[PDB]
């Protein structure tokens, strides 16, 4: 809609609306270019009127961003595709297409036939995918020299929590291997959130400690009830004890209170009998889902019993399969006279409870059903732990994502700065329109590093010099070795020495957005017979 308008519905009728669409689309695509990366400046973006979102994640914003154009539709669409796809490249897929939708359609009408135009991107979108998957040269959690420790360290080294890459390098190595959850279809990869990751504002930033078995989190400060016996075994219970209401769910509408008050008097005794009967089968530490109330927290502690209650079920579940207990076997109803067996006994070498840092847990030591491990973080404050935890998480997910992809390609546009030339070369000798096109592909691969480092204030010429100073004619080859360093640190914005770090993305999240972004250049094209409805 530009010029004197005799037609509605985004008709500037051709190159105008084409341009207006490349005006439209790119006007969305610019939010990312600055938002690219965490060092990429966040944007405080009103969702409705007074509802502001602060996001440097593009497709996250592109979900806030609403579609007023066919250009606006698809970029939100395709980035939200890549968004729900991974989450790596949400930002990234948005940037280059704005140029790629600024380029090929110009050739698409320069068609001898319209198809050969985008294929200049496409076989280049392949030629890169080849070159991409060819990259083990940076981003290696597949192997370090000490294998994952140094790689996790290089991850932690590419980060700063404070002092890191020390117990945390090791800690990443635990976390995946600490997870025996076998991801479906024979995937040798271990969910990194399946780890029990515990945190202490005590001790030291660098300090962290693995625990034998999964560490059960027992509520602290809330138990006048004994949780503590040192034994080999535990009883993991899915079950709870309440003296106020256990047998009583019924309404007060009953004409006589008689029934409710008298069973209420029976409810308390069996909760004292239930604990002992989970004690008498050989479990003195008895891990119960608990969740007793406030004034009910009074009722047990004053009257007395022993059960481990209010525990994290996530741990209690993990500890359940860890030690070999059963949260539910004969337990169905709620009662203190309910039958109990030894099938709920968890098997550990010992079951100990160690308090440290002013934090205590129920430690299931050497869980006999499955190998289990929980690392407990040590900060100087609760602040330090969110740093180490997520700096770990940088390696962690990547380590798993490197378990997902052996081919693991350099994070940062230094992968593209190569591809922005080799394919720019792969343009000319191609000849004709894809010569035209493959350069349009490659020459536009330059924009991610510029913007990103501009976002990190490492900018363009330096970065793009350094990136392609590495790559030569002498260095054309992905290799693994750096006289061409094809890596770029995202947070630095300047390419660095981290070849192993978990700040770099595997080939998984990469080959896609190539296909994604060019689709946006494709997707807008698709019209036959531009018209208007009235």
């Amino acid at each position: 809609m530009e010029g004197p308008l005799s037609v509605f519905g985004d008709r500037s009728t051709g190159e105008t609306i084409r341009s207006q669409n490349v005006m439209a689309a790119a006007s969305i695509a610019n939010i990312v270019k600055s938002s690219l990366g965490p060092v990429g400046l966040d944007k405080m973006l009103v969702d409705d009127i007074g509802d502001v979102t602060i996001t440097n994640d593009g497709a996250t914003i592109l979900k806030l961003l609403e579609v007023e154009h066919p250009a606006a539709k698809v970029l939100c669409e395709l980035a939200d595709l890549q968004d729900k796809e991974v989450g790596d490249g949400t930002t990234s897929v948005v940037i280059i297409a704005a140029e790629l939708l600024k380029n090929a359609d110009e050739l698409v009408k320069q068609k001898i036939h319209p198809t050969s135009v985008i294929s200049g991107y496409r076989l280049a979108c392949k030629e890169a995918v080849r070159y991409i998957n060819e990259n083990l040269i940076v981003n290696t959690d597949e192997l370090g020299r000490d294998c994952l420790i140094n790689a996790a360290k290089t991850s932690m080294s590419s980060k700063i929590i404070g002092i890191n890459g020390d117990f945390f390098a090791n800690m990443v190595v635990d976390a995946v291997l600490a997870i025996k959850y076998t991801d479906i279809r024979g995937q040798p990869r271990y969910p990194v959130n399946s780890v029990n990751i515990l945190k202490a504002h005590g001790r030291s930033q660098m300090e962290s400690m693995l625990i034998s078995g999964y560490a059960l989190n027992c509520v602290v400060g809330s138990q006048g009830m004994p949780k503590r016996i040192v034994n080999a075994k535990i009883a993991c219970l899915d079950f709870s004890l309440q003296k106020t209401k256990m047998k009583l769910g019924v309404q007060v509408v009953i004409t006589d209170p008689e029934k409710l008050d008298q069973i209420r008097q029976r409810e308390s005794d069996i909760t004292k009998e239930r604990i002992q009967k989970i004690l008498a089968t050989g479990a003195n530490v008895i891990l119960t889902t608990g969740g007793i109330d406030d004034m009910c927290l009074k009722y047990f502690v004053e009257a007395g019993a022993m059960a481990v209650r209010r525990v994290l079920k996530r741990d209690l579940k993990r500890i359940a399969k860890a030690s070999g207990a059963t949260i539910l076997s004969t337990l169905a109803n709620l009662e203190g006279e309910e039958t109990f067996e030894a099938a709920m006994l968890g098997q550990a070498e010992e079951v100990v409870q160690e308090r440290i840092c002013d934090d205590e847990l129920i430690l299931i030591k050497n869980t006999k059903a499955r190998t289990s491990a929980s690392i407990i973080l040590r900060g100087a404050n609760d602040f330090m732990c969110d740093e180490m935890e997520r700096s770990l998480h940088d390696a962690l997910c990547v380590v798993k994502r490197v378990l997902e992809s052996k081919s693991v390609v350099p994070g940062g546009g230094a992968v593209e700065a190569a591809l922005s030339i080799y394919l720019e070369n792969y343009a000319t000798s191609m000849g004709s329109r894809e010569q035209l096109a493959i350069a349009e592909f490659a020459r536009s691969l330059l924009v991610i590093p510029n913007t990103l480092a501009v976002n990190a204030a490492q900018d363009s010429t330096d970065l793009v010099a350094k990136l392609r100073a590495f790559h030569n004619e002498a260095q054309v080859n992905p290799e693994r070795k750096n006289l061409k360093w094809i890596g770029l640190d995202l947070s630095n914005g300047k390419p660095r020495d981290n070849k192993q770090a978990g700040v770099f993305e595997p080939t998984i999240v990469k080959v896609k957005s190539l296909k994604f972004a060019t689709e946006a250049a494709i997707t807008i094209l698709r019209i036959d017979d531009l018209i208007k409805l009235h």
Binding site: A24, S27, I28, N30, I31, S34, V39, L41, D42, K43, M44, L45, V46, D47, D48, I49, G50, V52, I54, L64, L65, E66, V67, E68, H69, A71, A72, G221, K243, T244, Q251, V252, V253, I254, T255, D256, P257, E258, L260, D261, R264, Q265, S268, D293, D294, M295, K298, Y299, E302, A303, A456, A457
Partner: protein
């Protein structure tokens, strides 16, 4: 929809609001105190030393002005005061550096500067933070009346500080969270209408004004015993469902009567069992509590678990289903006193509860109902000092050279820390010296050269402890000036302020909708 925005245009509008936010209160802040007037669209004056008031009352300027009242309430919650500080510090720190550095054009080297000045804050603070003793309510009282005199009140500084001293100690979390960080829920502040400071009793515990609403209830019984439902109230809350007739006037009434009659018999089941208190967390009915008040049983009704829970430990009351039904007891005494103290005929039961989590709702008395609020505020920020000084006996002398105490140490580290970051560090080195100089500009004379002489006096003699007087503008000892500035407050206001600046540094684009 489809939208994009740019940089300094979004960056300056921050300052554009942030500056104006920072402006009049810096004349209002400190001993120099001014009124920030609002002209209502209604035409009325609203005159404040507080910005959030005039801010909230008027059109919200979206990027900066929306941000700060939040970080104000962030700060207002932290130590209880310093909204004025944060909002002026940020916009201050947001001004000269930015365009300068953004004509030099970079977000990040500015960001690291926020921390270093905030760090150059921390150390020389805690270096020049003068430990003042909590073992002395005095060495609390000297600094606690100091922060109740912040702008307009030297009056309630005497009383409200007295109430705050041991209360803060008496203030407890229910984790045995200590009590130096203590909140105003566990410090709880309820001003009680009427009376006078001569009528004022020191309640270091909580008032349950629900406790005695009538003399029928237990009164002046040392510690209560709160029987919660479960037996002493058996269970029927319902009704017998009698017929209804639109014809008769009585049939509309008799159906609602039968609903209250069962709690009436639940509160009757209470009478014979003879609690001194029944806490009914589901509550009771109107005619029922008459039965309660027959046996001298005060009813705490429709009250949450935790109010009872805290009060139970606070008032020293057990938690039981029934006096003849035994899980035994919660607590027999958490309270060395039960005071039922009334202004008007509504009994406000003030129960002083020793080191209890409780509410520590602390009895405060104005000369009337209205000025109680300021007393409360005078009692709030009095607890601020206590909780500050209970947290850190270290705090810094004040009258504003504390704000210089960082500012020139920055100048030296600009020449020391250097890098290119010195320039943000130097550009943020400047921000801290306008505020005292404004107090001294409110004084005038040469507020500039004095501050340079202060800047001298900073490195020459003393950064803060020997400072400048805000209402005077002479070289003074901020310890000898007697104006004491809480250390944590410095940890708070600056920190909180730099972040919204980093925030409004971070966001160069704001899309609407």
């Amino acid at each position: 929809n489809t939208k994009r925005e740019s940089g300094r245009k979004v960056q300056s509008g921050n300052i554009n609001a942030a500056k104006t936010i920072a402006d009049i209160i810096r004349t209002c802040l400190g001993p120099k105190s001014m009124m920030k007037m609002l002209l209502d669209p209604m035409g009325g004056i609203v005159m404040t030393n507080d910005g959030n008031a005039i801010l909230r009352e008027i059109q919200v300027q979206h990027p900066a002005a929306k941000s700060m009242i939040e970080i104000s309430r962030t700060q207002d919650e932290e130590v209880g005061d310093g909204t004025t500080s944060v909002i002026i510090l940020a916009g201050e720190m947001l001004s000269v550096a930015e365009h300068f550095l953004e004509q030099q054009m970079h977000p990040t080297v500015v960001i690291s500067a926020y921390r270093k000045a905030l760090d150059d804050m921390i150390s020389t603070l805690k270096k020049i933070s003068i430990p003042v003793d909590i073992s002395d309510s005095d060495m609390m009282l000297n600094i606690i009346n100091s922060s109740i005199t912040t702008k307009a009140i030297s009056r309630w500084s005497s009383l409200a500080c007295n109430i705050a001293l041991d209360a803060v100690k008496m203030v407890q979390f229910e984790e045995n969270g200590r009590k130096e960080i203590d909140i105003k829920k566990y410090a709880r502040v309820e001003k009680i209408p009427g009376g006078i400071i001569e009528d004022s009793c020191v309640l270091r515990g909580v008032m349950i004004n629900k406790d005695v609403t009538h003399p029928r209830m237990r009164r002046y019984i040392k510690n209560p015993r709160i029987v919660l439902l479960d037996s002493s109230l058996e269970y029927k809350k319902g009704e017998s469902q009698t017929d209804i007739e639109i014809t008769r006037e009585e049939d509309f009434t008799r159906i609602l009567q039968m609903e209250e009659e069962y709690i009436q018999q639940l509160c009757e089941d209470i009478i014979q069992l003879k609690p001194d208190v029944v806490i009914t967390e589901k509550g009771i009915s109107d005619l029922a509590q008459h039965y309660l008040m027959r046996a001298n049983i005060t009813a705490i009704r429709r009250v949450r678990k935790t109010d009872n829970n805290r009060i139970a430990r606070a008032c020293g009351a057990r938690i039981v289903s029934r006096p003849e039904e035994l899980r035994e007891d919660d607590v027999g005494t958490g309270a060395g006193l039960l005071e039922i103290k009334k202004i008007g005929d509504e009994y406000f039961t003030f129960i002083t509860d020793c080191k209890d989590p409780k509410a520590c709702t602390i009895l405060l008395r104005g000369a009337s109902k209205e000025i109680l609020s300021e007393v409360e505020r005078n009692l709030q920020d009095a607890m601020q000092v206590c909780r500050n000084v209970l947290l850190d006996p270290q705090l810094v002398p004040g009258g504003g050279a504390s704000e210089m105490a960082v500012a020139h140490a920055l100048t030296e580290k600009s020449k020391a820390m250097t890098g290119v970051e010195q320039w943000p560090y130097r550009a943020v080195a400047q921000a801290l010296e306008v505020i005292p100089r404004t107090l001294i500009q409110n004084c005038g004379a040469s507020t500039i050269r004095l501050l340079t002489s202060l800047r001298a006096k900073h490195t020459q003699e003393n950064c803060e402890t020997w400072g400048v007087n805000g209402e005077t503008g002479t070289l003074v000892d901020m310890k000898e000036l007697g104006i004491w500035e809480p250390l944590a407050v410095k940890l708070q206001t600056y920190k909180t302020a730099v972040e919204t600046a980093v925030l409004l540094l971070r966001i160069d684009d704001i899309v609407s909708g």
